[PDB]
Amino acid sequence: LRLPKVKPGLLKGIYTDEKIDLRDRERLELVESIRHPKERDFYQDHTYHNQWIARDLESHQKIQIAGRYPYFSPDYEIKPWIWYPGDTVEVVSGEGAGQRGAIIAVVKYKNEILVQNVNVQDVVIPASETRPEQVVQREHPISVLRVRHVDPSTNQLCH
Amino acid sequence: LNAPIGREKEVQPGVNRVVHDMGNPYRRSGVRSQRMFRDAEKNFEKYIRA
Amino acid sequence: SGHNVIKMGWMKIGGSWKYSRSYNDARRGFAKGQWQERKMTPRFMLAPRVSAGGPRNRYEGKASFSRLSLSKLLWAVDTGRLNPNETITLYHLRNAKVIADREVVWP
Amino acid sequence: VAPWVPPPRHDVKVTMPPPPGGEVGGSYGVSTGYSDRLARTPYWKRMALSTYALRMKENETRYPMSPHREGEYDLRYTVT
Amino acid sequence: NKRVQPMRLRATNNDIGQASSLKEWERSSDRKYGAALAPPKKRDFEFRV
Amino acid sequence: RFYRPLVNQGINLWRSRMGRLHKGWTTWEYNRDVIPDPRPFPEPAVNNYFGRSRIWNPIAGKIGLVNRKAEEWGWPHQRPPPTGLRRSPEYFPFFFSRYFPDVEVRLVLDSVLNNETTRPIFHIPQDMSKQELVNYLKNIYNIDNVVRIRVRNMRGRRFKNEVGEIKSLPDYKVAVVELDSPVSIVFKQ
Amino acid sequence: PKPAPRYNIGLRPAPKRQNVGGQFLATQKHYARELWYKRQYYSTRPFAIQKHMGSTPRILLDRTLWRSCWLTKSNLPDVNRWEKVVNSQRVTEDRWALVEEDGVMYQVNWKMYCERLETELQKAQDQLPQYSFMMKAVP
Amino acid sequence: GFTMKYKRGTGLWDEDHVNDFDANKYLSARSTMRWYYGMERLQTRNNMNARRATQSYNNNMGLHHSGRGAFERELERRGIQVDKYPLTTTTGAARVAEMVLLRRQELEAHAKKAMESQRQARRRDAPSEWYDETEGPLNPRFLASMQSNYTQVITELPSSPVTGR
Amino acid sequence: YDSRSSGVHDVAPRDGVDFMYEGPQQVLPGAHPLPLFHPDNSVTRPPVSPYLPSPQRPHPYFTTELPELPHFQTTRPIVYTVGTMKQRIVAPVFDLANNVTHTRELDPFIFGFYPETEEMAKNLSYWLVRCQNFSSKWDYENREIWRKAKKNWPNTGMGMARVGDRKNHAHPWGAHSKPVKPWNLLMPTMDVKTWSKSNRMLVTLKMLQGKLQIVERLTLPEPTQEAYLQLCRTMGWDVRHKGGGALFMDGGSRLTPSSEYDRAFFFGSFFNGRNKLVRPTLLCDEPYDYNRTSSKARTKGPKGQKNPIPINRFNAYDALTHDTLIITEGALLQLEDEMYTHKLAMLPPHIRAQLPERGFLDSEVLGDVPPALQTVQMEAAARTEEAEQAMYAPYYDNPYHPWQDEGEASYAVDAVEGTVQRYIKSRKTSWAMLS
Amino acid sequence: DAAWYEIPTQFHTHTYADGTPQSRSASLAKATKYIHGMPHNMGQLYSYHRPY
Amino acid sequence: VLLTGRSVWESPIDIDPTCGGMKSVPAHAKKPKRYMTHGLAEVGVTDI
Amino acid sequence: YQRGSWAPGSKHQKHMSLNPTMYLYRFAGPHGPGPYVMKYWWTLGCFPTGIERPFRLPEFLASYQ
RNA sequence: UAGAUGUUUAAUGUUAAUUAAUUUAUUAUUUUAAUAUUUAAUAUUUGUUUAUACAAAAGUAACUUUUUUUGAAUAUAAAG
RNA sequence: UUUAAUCAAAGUUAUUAUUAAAUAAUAUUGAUUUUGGAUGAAUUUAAUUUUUAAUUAUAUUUUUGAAUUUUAAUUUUAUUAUUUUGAUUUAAUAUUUUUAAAAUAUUAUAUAUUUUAGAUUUAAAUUUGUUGUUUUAUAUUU
């Protein structure tokens, strides 16, 4: 909170123009050949211990997987459901605090909302050899925790 | 950043700023602990308005 | 915030422990009790004990009264705690708070 | 499992609960007597099926002695 | 505690009193006022075990 | 009150006589009476292994019946069916079996594709015997040219999902039904 | 009434188990540092993050911890803002920076002050005749 | 063991003779209610079990739930009162509380009329020597309260001291 | 020290907030020749008082009857004691409409006890330790770690350290041999001497500062929270969370005292700010402890007094974290009643012997005076007790006329039984005590 | 205060959107086979331990 | 749901919040009733 | 015996009595999976010891989703 | 320079009553469990050529679709 | 192209979390799926002993050889405990961490402050005829 935060490569100091990670899958033929022919690595096909036992994840692994899919909790939905397609709602806080737009769709189990023109991003569409790389702009699901309704008379906050 | 209940404009000025709410610590807990504290921001308004 | 190293005085924490041998004994509650004096026999082993009970054995029934000074009484009737019209007994003293109740034990 | 848990030993009285076991032939180990039929029976019922002359005849006390085991102290009122 | 003194060798009447004279004992009628020092109550004559 | 044991030998210090050993473990201190846990820790009674050697637990559970009670007749509410009916072919769970069978005979589409095979192969459940299958082709699909049925009780297939959680496909059986006539499937081509 | 054993008066945090201390002095829990931010003895003190060690907090901002760890998704909702307390109101003004001038220090938008550096530097390097290239994990 | 059961329900309010060692030198306004509803709970939650106990216990010993048996059932029929001292009951002491509440509401009614007399009797417009500050200045945020007493503006003191005239 | 010799202040002013020093003719914000950590003027923490506190006038209140509003006296007559202020304390009471209805004396014993720090400390030192969650201060011990019992390796042949059964504080799984469990701690004791005396010297400091204000009634006309917050704006109680807030000792009106609050106010009294609400008494119960010798070894909770002071009393931590004290006149009467028999027993004999002359000892029980105005609850219990003063008539165990026959008893000692018996007209009335 | 749920939301539901408890526990175990196994909507899983 | 932007109401997955725990819970399980419970639920304190 | 530390990825020697190991061929070090234990992660599927579990998720959110 | 005749820590330190520059006095030589060296330019590894019998227990890191019998049910590879 | 050879590493890394521990007096036939399977003995744990029952004092007294104190108000509330407020408050808070930055003194041998010289027991404990015993420490952070 004290000093500015810019692109992680500019004031940090190690500025590269193209980082290459060799541990990826694409670069397998680049590493599996760099090492000597005399560097034999066994267990290429079979492991030693029994791997069809059921096991947990790393500590840090759950921590990542609990934040992605939180609705797997019991009753993650909002206890009364008051957001519906066609509602007249305005955002409140966060990015673009104060825009007005009508709901078009609701993702109920996630406590979020698809609202016109608010929080619009470019849904890139990777494609196989038939179509090229396609990009498509599309507004995104935003949480209902940060939107309130445009009262058809007072046009203010209204539960 | 404080002045008696009537001298509320004369604080150290700021920039684009909108009073969000009062920092009632239970705003962090689950929504049933924010269904309480619902009107406690409404009620507190006219207490600092003359 | 210091260590009363015996025969050396108060010492800083983190200080020097080279000279705190008998202090590491006192903290452990370990009591030698001057027992290296084997040579000189104390009055303990040579003191004939009278009275298979003891010198002041307060056996049941021993009439050991709790002393009440008379001058403590004459000071509480002119202070105003005791009304000299009435037959002053043990009830008033306790209630006039002349004497506490820890003093009164049978008899 | 137990089909038909047996009834208490001597629930002949209509108001007061049966005496502890052993006294009437059973297993020593409780100083009370509990007839579930007596408790579940409500009060207006328990007083209905008796008369005052009879109520004073099963509240009857033998306190220093047992009413069932002759010559024996009331093992409702003993230490154990 | 520089305040207190050494506990004496033989008991004293204020020690035998203060021990059972706290607030917490105020209702312990028996054993109050040194009942354990008096000669026992003359037990009942119809007493038996 | 309990009065703590005492360990400061000195002027008296003669534990050799009346002093009974109080080195006996200090029950008074741990008096918090909730059992510790056994030092060789008994594993959970759930079977963790999932490979091809997944054995079947013989030990008969407790809640197993108390759920098959309430699923043949409401257990805590409705009264038990009379045993003459309970042990009868009219006991509903057995009734719904002589007139409403529920099996799953999944023929591998891979077997009879464009090729022509006189021995189709079936992924029949594990309860169904050889005869029970023939009587299932002849009565529901009217396939009445079986010669011999073989049996390869195969364990269901394992796999790990994207996270990496072990899952399995319900066990089945492979029954190489020797047909009389070469049957194929005319894949539209 | 023997006077109260107020060792750490409040509200300095509890001690850490010295060779000295009464049977009543409640030290810090074994394996738990007493100065929260001093994880690593030379850890510099955080800037605007004070963990509300103590009773329930009177006013709890979003950037201050309370029975929690830091979390940029929750402890800092929008980094372009900067929450204060004016007249007991949790207000969130603009974030600025103390950029330089002729000899004065005037605050400019902290989102604008960082849009330059993210570009004026990124546009500085790309016009430098090199090709920086780090290959990670050479076996 | 010995824990002084003869002191539990014997406080004036409902918060004494109860170990609340788990306190906190600042209880939030949400955490004060819960502390009241707490201390209010373990007095009813306490006895509402000691009533269920002794009533379900008499039902098993063969008595009336209250504790009456055969004899003290007859006496009430004969018209004799059974207990020595009939202590004032719910409807009794919850009725006395409608006395000392009803005369005070009438005493505090007439006190409106007696206060107006001795306030519209001595009703100056210039305050007496108390309006001096030769010793210590006045509290101007208080003068806004004495102002409704007189007509002359007390709420305006010069920057110079006020001799108190 | 004096490291960091550069790099602290950037060598430039800020944009429009930094001012250089003009000179010694103008005055800076905050400057004062006294060390003040909480610097306050009469605008930020305005004392609600007639005057302004000063070294000239001993207290910011009237010391003499101002004749433009009626004068009330205290309920109980005032006698001056050791720590008293030795001067009249006439304090103007207020009305819920922010007015000044009448003026009223204040008992020097309670409100004029000149403060001392070496005793208000005992009030704070008691609180800062009593107001403390003990059960949270629970750590494991050596014998709660669940590890092997055997030495984790033979101590000799191994190239290791001479250690067995590694479950100790040196290891990242062990625990302190003598750790801090709740019941090891201390709930300090606090008697009535040093609790009252401390508290009475806090309601005096709250006067000497001028933050004291007596109120007629604290009832809200409706049980909402709006009527609470609106009551503070008109009466002027800054109660925002940051600005200094009020302290509400509550006791009902003057004519209708009540030890409990008003359901209207109590329900509106709940607001997340610098507001408090305390019981209208300064005295407290006598400290006892039953588990004084760890007899009940199943206990949880600190050693010491098992009768702690409840949090909603008047303490020294919220006496200062809430600046303004707001007493109701009902609360006043109860303070003067419960402290009455206290100040009288705290007088010398030669002076205690003049009280029966000066109308201090007019006993409402001997009828020498009509009964004093009592609290709504404590009068209700006096109407009940007076009501049943008759049911004990026909029995020889009457509490109001005990020992009716101590004039006719004829005590007779017999030497066959250990008995001194008494006869009332030849009929034995002693009772052989059952066992 | 009977509002507090007298059957916990953590308990695996009856899976019967019809409106009645589907076989209670009896049948969640039949449908947990559908959970510990693979659901019906399930498309191409990514991992290298694949069913076939 | 992002691509088209359609609505979806019931979750597409039959979560088991017990993770094979209900295999040990009798089908007649239902929590008891607790009188004089603790907490500010029965009093909806929207004021603070 | 037992000269280094007690973790399986330690530095000095050990013994099978004091610190009995499970024979783990090649696992990940404290600083991450080097390019040797990933030659399996893209061919074998999981690290060759069998004990670690193949969290292949964020690749699935890379390609398929 | 500097109190003094030398071994019981200094603290409202972003008032645990604060909210944008705190730039927090803070670290136990060794018994702890993690990492990092040094031995280490290393010791040891290094795959161009030999002569084939069957059971069981033993594993199940494991897959299977493809011919078990004319027995119904069951099971057909793998160490210590 | 010449480098006579040498000489240095300082002070920053993303993107995801609400779990532990103590506290609370309102449950309870054993935690990890469908018994026997012959219709029968498989699925039996019972007995007057500080026991998942846990005790408000300092006196007296057994050999003073260590032992140690009695209903508190009799069915009255020291009770074996969780819930439609991330249950409540307090106390504690972490890797996958994967991150990483520059040419001053010398140049024929005594160890930092650059005027070039001078200056040198590694510490702690241990040893009280051994201060100088014959152990310990690679370093870093907890």
XYZ file of N, CA and C in Angstrom, chain H residues 1-4 7-8 12-27 29 32-33 35-36 39 81 83-88 93 96-97 99-101 103-104 107-109 111 115 118-119 122-124 126-146 148-150, chain I residues 42 46-52 54 56-57 62 64 66-70 94 98 100-102 128 130-135 187 216 236 241 254-256 259-261 266 270-272 277 279 281 285 288 290 296 300-302 306-313 317-318 373-374 376 379-380 383-384 388 391-392 395 397:
459
model
N -20.180 -29.802 44.233
C -19.911 -29.799 45.659
C -20.520 -28.609 46.363
N -19.748 -27.912 47.191
C -20.240 -26.670 47.771
C -19.963 -25.536 46.803
N -21.024 -24.907 46.321
C -20.911 -23.821 45.372
C -21.896 -22.696 45.640
N -22.508 -22.659 46.824
C -23.422 -21.602 47.236
C -24.687 -21.544 46.401
N -27.366 -18.597 46.956
C -27.082 -17.222 46.590
C -27.351 -16.950 45.121
N -27.681 -17.977 44.340
C -27.735 -17.825 42.892
C -28.845 -16.874 42.472
N -30.308 -8.606 43.430
C -31.306 -7.589 43.127
C -31.594 -7.560 41.633
N -30.573 -7.320 40.825
C -30.706 -7.480 39.388
C -30.435 -8.941 39.050
N -30.250 -9.247 37.768
C -30.061 -10.623 37.330
C -28.639 -10.918 36.878
N -27.668 -10.090 37.255
C -26.306 -10.212 36.755
C -25.279 -10.468 37.846
N -25.702 -10.667 39.085
C -24.775 -10.861 40.183
C -24.803 -12.308 40.642
N -23.779 -12.676 41.410
C -23.591 -14.049 41.866
C -23.553 -15.007 40.684
N -22.813 -14.612 39.656
C -22.642 -15.432 38.470
C -21.281 -15.133 37.863
N -20.436 -16.156 37.774
C -19.091 -15.991 37.247
C -19.113 -15.731 35.753
N -19.113 -14.466 35.367
C -18.852 -14.095 33.982
C -17.387 -13.698 33.823
N -16.506 -14.673 34.045
C -15.088 -14.405 33.880
C -14.724 -14.152 32.428
N -15.597 -14.512 31.490
C -15.369 -14.263 30.069
C -16.023 -12.939 29.687
N -15.417 -11.858 30.146
C -15.893 -10.519 29.854
C -14.970 -9.869 28.838
N -15.232 -8.599 28.547
C -14.462 -7.892 27.531
C -14.644 -6.400 27.734
N -13.535 -5.686 27.941
C -13.576 -4.289 28.354
C -14.253 -3.388 27.347
N -14.542 -3.881 26.151
C -15.422 -3.181 25.226
C -16.331 -4.211 24.577
N -17.598 -4.213 24.967
C -18.603 -5.067 24.361
C -19.371 -4.265 23.325
N -22.218 -3.046 20.665
C -23.652 -2.914 20.902
C -24.404 -4.179 20.524
N -23.563 -6.471 23.597
C -24.161 -6.174 24.891
C -25.551 -6.766 25.032
N -26.380 -6.655 23.995
C -27.647 -7.371 23.981
C -27.443 -8.831 24.342
N -25.145 -10.204 25.856
C -24.791 -10.358 27.259
C -25.992 -10.165 28.167
N -26.961 -9.346 27.762
C -28.173 -9.225 28.563
C -29.069 -10.431 28.356
N -27.402 -13.250 30.465
C -27.701 -13.217 31.890
C -29.194 -13.343 32.157
N -57.234 -23.815 55.185
C -55.985 -23.506 54.510
C -54.895 -24.434 55.022
N -51.178 -24.411 54.158
C -49.838 -23.935 54.449
C -49.885 -22.853 55.514
N -48.813 -22.772 56.302
C -48.803 -21.860 57.438
C -48.890 -20.413 56.977
N -47.896 -19.960 56.221
C -47.856 -18.585 55.739
C -48.098 -18.577 54.242
N -49.255 -18.147 53.775
C -49.445 -18.042 52.329
C -48.745 -16.808 51.794
N -47.583 -17.001 51.181
C -46.812 -15.872 50.694
C -47.515 -15.238 49.507
N -47.335 -13.930 49.363
C -47.959 -13.241 48.249
C -47.503 -13.888 46.949
N -47.900 -9.844 44.078
C -46.810 -8.886 43.968
C -46.726 -8.244 42.595
N -49.077 -5.234 43.532
C -48.450 -4.161 44.298
C -47.611 -3.279 43.393
N -46.961 -3.871 42.399
C -46.230 -3.087 41.421
C -47.141 -2.199 40.589
N -49.300 -0.338 42.281
C -49.620 0.722 43.222
C -48.566 1.803 43.125
N -47.332 1.420 43.431
C -46.207 2.334 43.503
C -45.862 2.776 42.096
N -46.592 2.254 41.123
C -46.506 2.763 39.769
C -47.654 3.700 39.451
N -49.492 5.672 41.917
C -49.431 6.934 42.640
C -48.290 7.805 42.136
N -47.183 7.198 41.720
C -46.100 7.986 41.156
C -46.513 8.613 39.837
N -48.455 11.308 41.258
C -47.593 12.298 41.892
C -46.765 13.047 40.855
N -46.247 12.338 39.851
C -45.505 12.992 38.785
C -46.409 13.746 37.828
N -47.720 13.512 37.885
C -48.649 14.353 37.144
C -48.814 15.702 37.827
N -46.861 17.034 39.955
C -45.580 17.728 40.002
C -45.380 18.633 38.800
N -44.352 22.428 39.777
C -43.120 22.959 39.207
C -43.382 24.247 38.448
N -43.620 27.363 41.097
C -42.342 27.872 41.577
C -41.351 28.158 40.459
N -41.744 27.994 39.194
C -40.926 28.423 38.068
C -41.479 29.653 37.379
N -40.565 32.941 40.478
C -39.257 33.589 40.417
C -38.743 33.454 38.991
N -39.057 34.436 38.157
C -38.913 34.330 36.709
C -38.238 35.573 36.145
N -37.083 35.924 36.701
C -36.364 37.113 36.277
C -36.049 37.064 34.787
N -33.017 39.093 33.986
C -31.591 39.335 34.100
C -31.012 38.394 35.140
N -30.072 37.530 34.776
C -29.557 36.555 35.736
C -28.750 37.221 36.829
N -28.747 36.587 37.995
C -28.065 37.149 39.149
C -26.571 36.899 39.058
N -25.873 37.091 40.172
C -24.418 37.038 40.220
C -23.834 35.763 39.626
N -24.655 34.732 39.421
C -24.134 33.539 38.773
C -23.682 33.823 37.351
N -24.104 34.945 36.775
C -23.714 35.350 35.436
C -22.360 36.030 35.401
N -21.533 35.802 36.407
C -20.205 36.384 36.466
C -19.172 35.416 35.908
N -18.089 35.968 35.363
C -16.939 35.141 35.025
C -15.637 35.833 35.382
N -15.644 36.622 36.455
C -14.401 37.178 36.968
C -13.463 36.090 37.459
N -13.998 34.924 37.812
C -13.158 33.807 38.229
C -12.893 32.846 37.074
N -13.942 32.268 36.511
C -13.781 31.361 35.405
C -14.806 31.614 34.326
N -14.391 31.532 33.072
C -15.311 31.829 31.971
C -16.531 30.926 31.947
N -17.503 31.262 31.115
C -18.737 30.504 31.012
C -18.670 29.526 29.849
N -19.589 28.570 29.868
C -19.674 27.550 28.839
C -20.715 27.979 27.826
N -20.322 28.566 26.698
C -21.322 29.081 25.753
C -22.243 28.016 25.194
N -21.808 26.762 25.129
C -22.687 25.678 24.717
C -23.670 25.281 25.807
N -23.550 25.862 26.998
C -24.549 25.732 28.048
C -25.498 26.912 28.085
N -24.989 28.120 27.843
C -25.847 29.293 27.775
C -27.003 29.100 26.816
N -26.852 28.227 25.823
C -27.978 27.894 24.967
C -29.088 27.192 25.733
N -28.829 26.762 26.966
C -29.836 26.097 27.781
C -30.488 27.023 28.798
N -29.724 27.907 29.436
C -30.343 28.935 30.260
C -31.105 29.961 29.436
N -33.593 29.743 27.356
C -35.041 29.585 27.424
C -35.619 29.988 28.772
N -34.797 30.465 29.702
C -35.289 30.941 30.985
C -35.670 32.411 30.938
N -34.767 33.268 30.481
C -35.012 34.696 30.399
C -35.351 35.090 28.971
N -12.881 23.629 24.159
C -14.292 23.648 24.499
C -15.189 23.546 23.290
N -16.883 19.633 24.604
C -17.448 20.740 25.350
C -18.061 20.252 26.647
N -17.562 20.721 27.785
C -18.138 20.301 29.063
C -19.512 20.918 29.244
N -20.469 20.099 29.662
C -21.825 20.566 29.897
C -21.879 21.053 31.341
N -21.711 22.354 31.526
C -21.608 22.932 32.856
C -21.951 24.406 32.762
N -22.407 25.005 33.846
C -22.640 26.449 33.843
C -21.385 27.226 33.516
N -20.357 27.041 34.321
C -19.106 27.741 34.120
C -18.159 26.871 33.308
N -16.920 27.311 33.192
C -15.855 26.535 32.601
C -14.873 26.164 33.688
N -11.865 25.632 36.141
C -10.866 26.665 36.352
C -10.136 26.373 37.648
N -9.721 28.867 39.676
C -10.327 29.833 40.583
C -11.574 29.260 41.243
N -12.580 28.934 40.448
C -13.799 28.361 40.996
C -13.625 26.860 41.171
N -22.865 25.825 40.118
C -23.271 26.826 41.087
C -22.950 26.323 42.479
N -24.167 28.153 45.012
C -25.116 28.984 45.737
C -26.400 29.057 44.927
N -29.118 29.889 42.763
C -29.546 30.910 41.814
C -31.064 31.047 41.877
N -31.584 32.249 42.042
C -32.990 32.391 42.428
C -33.950 32.498 41.259
N -33.506 32.202 40.042
C -34.387 32.271 38.885
C -34.889 30.900 38.459
N -34.823 29.922 39.347
C -35.365 28.591 39.120
C -35.343 27.832 40.439
N -36.372 27.039 40.729
C -36.541 26.506 42.081
C -35.369 25.639 42.508
N -31.354 18.881 33.963
C -31.829 19.208 32.634
C -33.124 18.470 32.341
N -33.765 19.653 26.370
C -32.547 20.455 26.467
C -32.827 21.800 27.128
N -33.231 23.760 31.385
C -32.734 23.746 32.753
C -33.935 24.011 33.643
N -34.570 22.949 34.128
C -35.779 23.142 34.913
C -35.452 23.658 36.307
N -34.746 22.866 37.101
C -34.482 23.239 38.475
C -33.035 22.955 38.821
N -9.021 -3.813 34.005
C -8.199 -4.316 32.915
C -7.840 -5.781 33.068
N -10.066 -7.918 35.196
C -11.362 -8.572 35.251
C -12.007 -8.613 33.876
N -11.994 -7.492 33.160
C -12.507 -7.437 31.795
C -11.492 -8.111 30.879
N -11.535 -9.439 30.867
C -10.487 -10.213 30.218
C -10.929 -11.650 29.998
N -10.918 -12.116 28.755
C -11.331 -13.482 28.459
C -10.232 -14.429 28.908
N -10.503 -15.202 29.957
C -9.511 -16.135 30.467
C -9.504 -17.425 29.670
N -10.682 -17.990 29.426
C -10.775 -19.253 28.715
C -10.059 -19.238 27.375
N -8.541 -13.729 38.948
C -9.593 -12.732 39.009
C -9.419 -11.992 40.323
N -33.593 14.875 34.226
C -34.873 14.544 34.844
C -35.289 13.113 34.528
N -27.821 17.204 22.833
C -26.449 17.514 22.528
C -25.441 16.461 22.905
N -19.115 7.218 16.948
C -18.152 6.229 17.408
C -16.801 6.852 17.718
N -37.493 11.596 39.150
C -37.293 11.937 40.553
C -38.369 11.316 41.426
N -39.627 11.422 41.006
C -40.714 10.875 41.802
C -40.842 9.369 41.639
N -40.420 8.824 40.501
C -40.519 7.394 40.226
C -39.130 6.802 40.011
N -34.606 1.000 39.930
C -33.262 0.463 39.747
C -33.072 -0.118 38.354
N -34.135 -0.597 37.733
C -34.027 -1.073 36.369
C -34.369 0.049 35.396
N -33.944 -0.124 34.152
C -34.075 0.934 33.163
C -35.526 1.025 32.710
N -34.174 1.326 27.285
C -33.344 0.135 27.170
C -33.301 -0.373 25.739
N -29.579 0.765 22.396
C -28.645 -0.091 21.680
C -28.305 0.562 20.351
N -27.066 1.022 20.236
C -26.601 1.720 19.051
C -25.088 1.605 19.024
N -24.545 1.236 17.868
C -23.120 0.957 17.718
C -22.342 2.269 17.717
N -24.536 2.184 29.114
C -25.693 2.178 29.997
C -25.348 1.307 31.190
N -25.715 0.304 35.627
C -26.654 0.186 36.726
C -26.503 1.374 37.670
N -25.985 2.170 40.660
C -25.374 1.970 41.964
C -23.864 1.991 41.814
N -21.402 -6.087 45.600
C -21.585 -7.198 46.518
C -20.274 -7.567 47.197
N -16.831 -13.156 47.722
C -16.626 -14.479 48.281
C -15.908 -15.350 47.263
N -15.549 -19.786 46.898
C -15.761 -21.084 47.516
C -14.643 -22.061 47.192
N -12.770 -28.042 44.524
C -13.434 -28.480 43.308
C -12.430 -28.458 42.168
N -13.341 -24.599 35.998
C -12.692 -23.799 34.974
C -12.986 -22.347 35.279
N -11.987 -21.496 35.112
C -12.112 -20.121 35.514
C -11.056 -19.766 36.530
N -10.688 -18.495 36.578
C -9.481 -18.102 37.305
C -9.584 -18.358 38.794
N -14.784 -15.735 43.140
C -15.777 -16.362 42.283
C -17.083 -15.592 42.268
N -17.014 -14.270 42.348
C -18.196 -13.413 42.422
C -17.894 -12.104 41.701
N -17.461 -12.174 40.444
C -16.856 -11.000 39.815
C -17.873 -9.900 39.585
N -17.354 -8.703 39.358
C -18.214 -7.537 39.140
C -18.770 -7.596 37.725
N -20.078 -7.483 37.529
C -20.617 -7.552 36.169
C -20.220 -6.330 35.364
N -20.126 -6.519 34.047
C -19.528 -5.502 33.194
C -20.340 -4.218 33.149
N -21.639 -4.278 33.413
C -22.486 -3.112 33.246
C -22.509 -2.217 34.466
N -21.593 -2.399 35.405
C -21.495 -1.446 36.492
C -20.676 -0.244 36.044
N -12.742 2.222 33.331
C -12.338 2.176 31.935
C -13.352 2.869 31.040
N -14.639 2.669 31.298
C -15.667 3.389 30.570
C -16.046 4.697 31.238
N -39.242 8.754 50.399
C -39.495 8.367 49.021
C -38.537 7.261 48.623
N -39.083 6.113 48.243
C -38.281 4.935 47.972
C -38.460 4.502 46.526
N -39.274 2.419 43.201
C -40.524 1.757 42.850
C -40.495 0.301 43.277
N -40.101 0.031 47.227
C -41.315 0.366 47.955
C -42.353 -0.727 47.786
N -42.448 -1.285 46.578
C -43.316 -2.427 46.346
C -43.054 -3.524 47.360
N -44.578 -2.470 50.621
C -46.015 -2.669 50.704
C -46.363 -4.133 50.892
N -45.597 -5.034 50.275
C -45.775 -6.458 50.531
C -45.451 -6.795 51.977
N -48.275 -8.364 54.833
C -48.222 -9.611 55.580
C -47.759 -9.433 57.015
N -50.031 -11.910 59.197
C -50.217 -13.353 59.130
C -49.465 -14.093 60.222
N -48.431 -13.488 60.802
C -47.676 -14.116 61.872
C -48.254 -13.825 63.241
N -49.009 -17.323 65.864
C -47.943 -18.284 66.091
C -46.855 -17.712 66.990
N -43.832 -18.074 66.750
C -42.618 -17.830 65.988
C -42.675 -16.510 65.239
